[PDB]
Design a protein around this ligand. Structure first.
Ligand code: HEC
Ligand code: HEC
Ligand SMILES: O=C1O[C@H]([C@@H](O)CO)C(O)=C1O
Ligand SMILES: O=C1O[C@H]([C@@H](O)CO)C(O)=C1O
Lengths: 126, 126
């Protein structure tokens, strides 16, 4: 769907921007600094769920650029492993949110964040 | 969810960026220049559906900036009318896509795009 590689870069950066907001905004809730409203969180994780599937199609071949490391393309199976694993951690967070269980939510939140960071560590330029 | 107004600006701009991609990428399909796969389009409009609900919460009070005109806030009921109407046109597009009917999809697509443009004309800076 991208006329030029730059358009794929712009897309994925915007998807990540939204993912950061929908993930990060739950930090005060899982810390207890903000109240836990199970329906609120269930709805927010559903948004996060949708957003978190979007970036991957915007790293198609020829779309090198931004802060994406070239290793995303030379090591495609491993990058795919990392995004699928991340999305499996998002499934786990969805299950916690759907269950309305703050303990499971905090554990699953931490797993998701670790997966974000592990991918950056390997595949996002400094 | 925004630490500073700038973060709300960044959010809404990213949401619009994704909406533009998920809307605009259907242009070749509704023109007949690309094949019509009903399941493909149903799925894409579901994404568009989710994205199109996101910007509005990122124009809260104090979040003036970007290419948002100040009229969004001094005329809140009218801006709310415009976003709700836009989202109702998105409902109409979802119904067309769910029905698998390319004629209804093209008509509904055109209504959505007109609603995007009408809001810009009134509320987005040059
Ligand atoms: C690989 C499997 C990743 C996972 C999982 C997550 N992210 Fe990431 N992110 C990745 C890359 C390769 C890039 C650079 C994209 C580019 O072309 O520049 C990014 C970037 C970001 C950004 C910055 C976006 C911007 O405005 O430029 C943010 C804020 C970000 N990523 C956040 C984020 C979060 C919160 C994640 C888990 C919930 C997450 N990412 C996962 C690669 C990968
Ligand atoms: C008001 C009810 C709007 C509707 C409906 C749509 N948009 Fe819009 N858009 C609006 C504003 C006020 C702004 C400026 C936001 C800012 O703070 O700068 C925008 C901006 C955009 C952009 C540019 C985003 C960027 O990267 O800076 C795009 C690409 C865009 N809008 C697209 C778009 C589409 C495709 C819409 C319908 C499917 C649509 N918008 C509706 C206000 C409103
Ligand atoms: O909110 C965020 O979480 C991840 C990472 O910091 C998790 O440790 C990331 O990159 C964000 O923007
Ligand atoms: O794809 C888009 O459609 C609207 C408008 O052009 C519809 O006429 C818009 O602002 C986009 O980026």
């Amino acid at each position: 769907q991208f006329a030029k590689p730059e358009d794929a870069v712009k897309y994925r950066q915007s998807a990540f921007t939204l993912m950061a907001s929908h993930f990060g905004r739950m930090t005060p809730v899982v810390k207890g600094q903000a109240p836990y409203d199970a329906a609120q969180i269930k709805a927010n994780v559903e948004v996060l769920k949708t957003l978190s599937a979007l970036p991957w199609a915007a790293f198609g071949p020829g779309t090198e650029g931004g802060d994406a490391r070239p290793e995303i393309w030379s090591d495609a199976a491993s990058f795919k492993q990392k995004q699928q694993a991340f999305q499996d951690n998002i499934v786990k967070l969805s299950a916690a949110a759907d269950a309305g269980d703050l303990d499971k939510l905090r554990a699953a939140f931490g797993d998701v964040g670790a997966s974000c960071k592990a991918c950056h560590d390997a595949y996002r330029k400094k």
